[PDB]
């Protein structure tokens, strides 16, 4: 199923990268709910290998399915799902089911990981539960990609009645605990057929967490397809949504001046994107903010970055995901920790920004502002499209919100916003707070017309107003 199972009036999933369960439970209540966010994508919660230096990537080397990691134990986990759901925020588990470890060691819960002899006692998995060792090295060969070891990690065999049952048990355990869905890691290295069988054995969502009767777990799958391979994202859309990686590449390239913003008129499938309701979109994720290349926009290039995030949240295409990063200078660098490997919780300081090194993009004004905008314009189509035939475009979402962009030149124009007459607070430059706008305001006449001004030297290159940020 391709239904996020959000609570009414909520939108967007936030990847709270490396957060602990206690901290997520708080954020759901103190910030996520009030701002109307739909859900949280957590880091793998199942026992993984303890690696030297405790890098971020250790989470992707499973050791068992015992819920006990640096993010917290099962009690902490259940406390989180209980508290977050009651606040209308859903929890999406990062499911690492394609492999186990790439070496011998111990896991976050003390379990043994015998890579050499393929024994994972805590599951248990033995050598007969894995594919015969070989190396992934040919992307024009789907059997090689799926059946061989990815960077030396023991490749599980989901074609097995045993392994399938183990994986369905793990996932069903997560559902009994109130999770709303799953982010499927390395789906590209697994077979559509096997996944179809596994996903189909998953129980309906646990109604004791505020889920409609008969609700089905949401499934979005990681398949990095930019074309020309024996494997296609289209082979996975029949049983779930697929993470659309072409999105970030095309927007990132456009918003850095690589393309003319006027061409976004036909944004969507016209560009080679999945059909919107099969896609889960994002500007950047935990992997490509590190090694995505020139086309990917990250917090390190905030101006174009925020413009791209605004466009994503203003446009009706697909389910939206927001990256919430921890500051880093090196690609192997793990989250803020102390000498014993304990994680350092982010601190919410005065101006509701975070301390201790977490970037907290989701607490950026321009980000929760547009999450508010996407909630206000819900159920509307893109209307009043305008463009200067170059790097300036604008359009409204029905008659509930307007948005302008400039990636070249100053925008000082009278445009039809299609909004009811009134004074609106730009949610990009400021916000509505106690009868005033802390930033720019816009006065909409009776013709739905308004004089829009957005100079190219401003801190932001986007302006956004909607019917819920009106005086």
């Amino acid at each position: 199923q391709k239904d996020a199972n959000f609570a009414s009036g909520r939108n967007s999933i936030v990847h709270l990268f490396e957060w602990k369960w206690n901290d997520i439970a708080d954020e759901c209540e103190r910030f996520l709910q009030p701002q109307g966010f739909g859900g949280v994508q957590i880091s793998p919660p199942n026992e993984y290998l303890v690696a030297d230096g405790r890098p971020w990537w250790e989470r992707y080397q499973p050791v068992s399915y015992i819920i006990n990691t640096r993010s917290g134990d099962e009690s902490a986990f259940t406390d989180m799902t209980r508290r977050c759901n009651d606040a209308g925020v859903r929890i999406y588990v990062d499911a690492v089911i394609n492999h186990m470890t790439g070496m011998n060691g111990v896991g976050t819960s003390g379990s043994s990981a015998d890579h050499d002899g393929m024994n994972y006692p805590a599951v248990p998995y033995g050598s007969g539960d894995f594919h015969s060792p070989c190396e992934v090295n040919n992307y024009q060969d789907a059997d090689n990609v799926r059946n061989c070891e990815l960077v030396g990690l023991r490749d599980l065999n989901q074609g097995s009645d045993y392994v399938r049952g183990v994986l369905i048990d793990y996932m069903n355990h997560m559902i009994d605990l109130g999770v709303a869905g799953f982010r499927v890691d390395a789906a590209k290295h697994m077979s559509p057929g096997d996944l179809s069988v596994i996903f189909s054995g998953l129980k309906n969502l646990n109604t004791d967490y505020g889920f409609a009767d008969g609700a089905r777990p949401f499934i979005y799958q990681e398949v990095i397809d930019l074309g020309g391979e024996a494997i296609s994202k289209n082979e996975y859309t029949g049983f779930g949504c697929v993470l659309e990686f072409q999105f970030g590449v095309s927007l990132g390239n456009a918003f850095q001046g690589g393309n003319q913003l006027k061409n976004l008129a036909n944004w969507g499938p016209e560009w080679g994107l999945l059909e919107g309701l099969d896609a889960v979109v994002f500007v950047d994720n935990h992997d490509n903010q590190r090694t995505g290349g020139s086309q990917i926009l990250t917090y390190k290039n905030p101006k174009p970055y925020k413009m791209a995030i605004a466009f994503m949240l203003a446009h009706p295409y697909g389910t939206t995901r927001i990256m919430s990063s921890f500051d880093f200078t090196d690609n192997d660098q793990g989250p803020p920790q102390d000498g014993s490997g304990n994680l350092i919780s982010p601190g919410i300081n005065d101006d509701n920004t975070c301390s201790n090194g977490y970037v907290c993009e989701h607490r950026w004004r321009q980000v929760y502002g547009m999450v508010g905008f996407r909630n206000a314009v819900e159920g509307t189509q893109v209307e009043n499209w305008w463009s200067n035939d170059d790097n300036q475009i604008a359009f409204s979402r029905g008659s509930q919100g307007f948005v302008a962009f400039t990636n070249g030149g100053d925008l000082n124009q009278n445009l039809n916003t299609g909004l009811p007459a009134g004074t609106y607070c730009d949610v990009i430059s400021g916000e509505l707070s106690g009868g005033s706008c802390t930033g720019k305001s816009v006065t909409v006449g009776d013709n739905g017309s308004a004089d829009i001004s957005l100079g190219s030297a401003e801190d932001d290159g986007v302006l956004a107003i909607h019917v819920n940020a009106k005086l």
């Binding site: 690696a51 890098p55 070496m103 024009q140 060969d141 390395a186 290295h189 020309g228 090694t291």
Partner: protein, 117 residues
């Protein structure tokens, strides 16, 4: 995630470990360009350092055996036969580039060693 980005054009540059070609050749057979072995080691270990730990072993594997990508293009397998230097002896030295004695670089296995190579 992680291993998923160990592909040329992503966490790994195109034609990775370019300079290590001549480094394994001279170290292994005394065959190579007329420049300081210390120099070549430096260049090679530099290229290797620029690749994050999680893709290091995969980068050497590509240097050794090669890779067929999304374009259908093959990349790597630079460690080919040279007069007086058979490919296989070279190919056997390659995994040693991350060890303490050489570049001493951490990898996905946690330490300065490339299992499964």
């Amino acid at each position: 995630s992680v291993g998923t980005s160990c592909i040329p054009g992503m966490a790994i540059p195109h034609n990775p470990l370019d300079s290590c070609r001549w480094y394994v050749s001279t170290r292994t057979c005394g065959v190579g360009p007329r420049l300081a072995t210390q120099e070549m080691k430096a260049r090679c270990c530099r290229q290797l350092e620029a690749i994050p730990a999680y893709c290091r072993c995969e980068a050497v594997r590509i240097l050794m055996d090669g890779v067929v990508t999304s374009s259908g293009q093959h990349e790597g397998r630079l460690l080919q036969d040279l007069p007086g230097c058979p490919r296989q002896v070279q190919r056997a030295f390659a995994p040693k580039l991350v060890t303490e004695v050489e570049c001493n670089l951490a990898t996905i296995h946690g330490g300065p060693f490339c299992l499964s190579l």
